Ligand binder design. Structure first.
Ligand SMILES: CSc1ccc2c(c1)[C@@H](N1CCN(C)CC1)Cc1ccccc1S2
Ligand SMILES: CSc1ccc2c(c1)[C@@H](N1CCN(C)CC1)Cc1ccccc1S2
Lengths: 383, 382
């Protein structure tokens, strides 16, 4: 029994409490940054952003209930706080960190329902629905941490020298590891590959509907009779109609209302250029095609931003990517620990795992343009 | 565009040849085991009954799954229709699931055989082994049952991706959960074995040093002090039961020989203590020379514990191979939806099936009962 913390000198001990309390703080500020931004901004009050808020709540509770106590226990190498504190430290640590994974999946589940059931769930999605999901996330995270302590009743010790999870029951060693990490993690990897292709699909959908509207504008311009024109317009009508069915979705930006109003305008123009041929004016419908092209240049160069909506999916992929690299090495290494300086690196991937609670809100700021401007506004880098 | 069409007929033939070889080798290997168990009277145990039902499982892969797979892989098309695609996946999922869970039920028996060695030796019957077999199959079934329960409501054969819920639940409950169970049950028993060898490897160091002492000892106080600690070492060696024999029957003939061997050696310590009371010391040093000869014969024979830890390691090679077989399938399966690629996905499916071959061949290579059973069959020995 040799604690390696003793070999590490006082200069580095200080640097490490400094560094870890920095991380602890950086996490306390970043997640507080998000929760305030959501609550204060009326624009952002959505069942979508509540999940994002309750995620930062969770990651904030790591920087509060877990991370500073870890800061002590990691640097020192001994647990001075006793048994009942060792209890709630692990309980909160598993529960918070569990809830942060399950808030991610409840987020991606809402994003799954926002697309596939876009028609259905837009009515179903209330704050109550977002709230009940949040409640079950915490409640599950609790009942993951609840089993170790029900069993602890047989032995009682006056003094405590160390605080790590119970390895007595293998049953709840696996159950926790999987139920808390593996299961909802693999869930998110599945919900990403799901929605990544969904985005890839609906963009090919509308890009093909654009090639319809693009080529048929060339047809109307080049068509020498009234029949080839209406033929183009009828294929443009059914294309704009089909394109309308598929919509990108969370705060729906003013620009996006403008591309949907850009379609109702465009369909308004297809209805007029048909009335123009009914009036018998063909070379006018070829001037109405010069018109549609200007509406195209107005709204569709702006629609070259549905291409951004697909990239807004990739950012959740980067969360998933970061999330994994953070926690997985812990869960890789934790199972090999009994067989396998080594205890130093186990302590490391716990912090690397806690580092997710920092990394989750900073991504939203970098990725999401709502928060980035909220961010630029606070420090005043952008007027 | 299906790439099976680009692959030429000569290689098509080599691949049905290779896969049907694997299909056969698996049909042969697992039948080899099941026959050996039933036929050998020595081997009839609830322990090997589990080992048999594992080979049963792996045999059903070489039957229900592998020859049908052999076709669908080489051609690239499923000609057999809907109701066949149903039972092919059902059997494939159920068998391959049962093979992971027969492994864990094996390691669960090995866990209860060691840690609860006192308790479970009475609890372990064939009935106890059998009910476990049943729940293994039953679980494996109810993993394959949901796709079909749900399709009732509403050219190629692959698993249902409609419910992401049961895409995951199946992937985890059938593979990830019990695999991680086995990795945990191995790290459990690997250290458990390391512990019981270290206990008695330390007891060896006690009785060795105290023999140096008594050989270098000049007094009755120093000798009797040595003898008391040698007695209590044998008594404290008796609280700890040995791992090779805990997996055996607790009352085995080999076990009584090491416990009676302790009673002999302690009986020898009782005379050399009584010898010091009479005032005879250098006679106890003729008695100490006597102790060394007896101890070496008994300890070199019990030095088969170097073997018990290694008999655990053979499950470690199974766990190791098993994972290397199936994991790449489960690595790739999650990356497939996003990410020529379908060629290698088909490959780790066969590499996964290759486990059904690799499981019984290990028992032969590892277990010395089968190795001799094998040499006898083919007439390897003159
Ligand atoms: C096999 S040991 C094990 C099993 C389950 C869980 C953990 C560790 C948990 N640790 C983290 C480190 N902390 C010092 C103790 C609790 C890791 C985690 C992370 C995120 C969500 C849920 C969980 S549950
Ligand atoms: C995400 S796709 C998926 C999900 C669950 C399972 C499989 C595949 C299973 N495959 C293998 C290939 N075979 C053609 C069909 C069944 C693989 C396997 C292997 C061992 C034990 C249980 C299982 S259950």
């Amino acid at each position: 029994d040799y604690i390696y913390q003793d070999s590490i000198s006082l200069p580095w001990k200080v640097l490490l409490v400094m560094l870890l309390a920095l991380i602890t703080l950086a996490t306390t500020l970043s997640n507080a940054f998000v929760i305030a931004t959501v609550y204060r901004t009326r624009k952002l009050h959505t069942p979508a952003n509540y999940l994002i808020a309750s995620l930062a709540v969770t990651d904030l509770l790591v920087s509060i209930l877990v991370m500073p106590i870890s800061t002590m226990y990691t640097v020192t190498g001994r647990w001075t706080l006793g048994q009942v504190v060792c209890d709630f430290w692990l309980s909160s640590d598993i529960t918070c960190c569990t809830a942060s994974i399950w808030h991610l999946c409840v987020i991606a589940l809402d994003r799954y329902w926002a697309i596939t059931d876009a028609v259905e769930y837009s009515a179903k999605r209330t704050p109550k629905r977002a709230a009940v999901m949040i409640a079950l996330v915490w409640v599950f995270s609790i009942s993951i941490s609840l089993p170790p302590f029900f069993w602890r009743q047989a032995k009682a010790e006056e003094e405590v020298s160390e605080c790590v999870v119970n390895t007595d029951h293998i049953l709840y060693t696996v159950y926790s590891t999987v139920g808390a990490f593996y299961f909802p993690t693999l869930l998110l990897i599945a919900l990403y590959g799901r929605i990544y292709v969904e985005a890839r699909s609906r963009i090919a959908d509308l890009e093909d509907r654009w090639r319809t509207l693009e080529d048929n504008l060339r047809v109307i311009e080049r068509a020498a009779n009234a029949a080839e024109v209406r033929e183009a317009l009828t294929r443009m009508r059914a294309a704009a109609e089909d394109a309308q069915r598929a919509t990108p979705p969370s705060p729906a930006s003013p620009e996006m209302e403008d591309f949907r109003h850009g379609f109702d305008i465009l369909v308004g123009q297809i209805d007029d250029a048909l009335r123009l041929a009914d009036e018998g004016r063909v070379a006018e419908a070829q001037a109405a095609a010069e018109e549609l092209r200007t509406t195209r240049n107005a709204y569709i160069q702006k629609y070259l931003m549905a291409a951004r909506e697909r990239k807004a999916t990739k950012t959740l992929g980067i969360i998933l990517g970061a999330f994994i690299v953070c926690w997985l090495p812990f869960f890789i290494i934790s199972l090999v620990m009994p067989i396998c300086f080594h205890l130093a690196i186990f302590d490391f991937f716990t912090w690397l795992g806690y580092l997710n609670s920092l990394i989750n809100p900073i991504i939203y700021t970098m990725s999401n343009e709502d928060f980035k401007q909220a961010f630029h506004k606070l420090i005043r880098f952008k007027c």
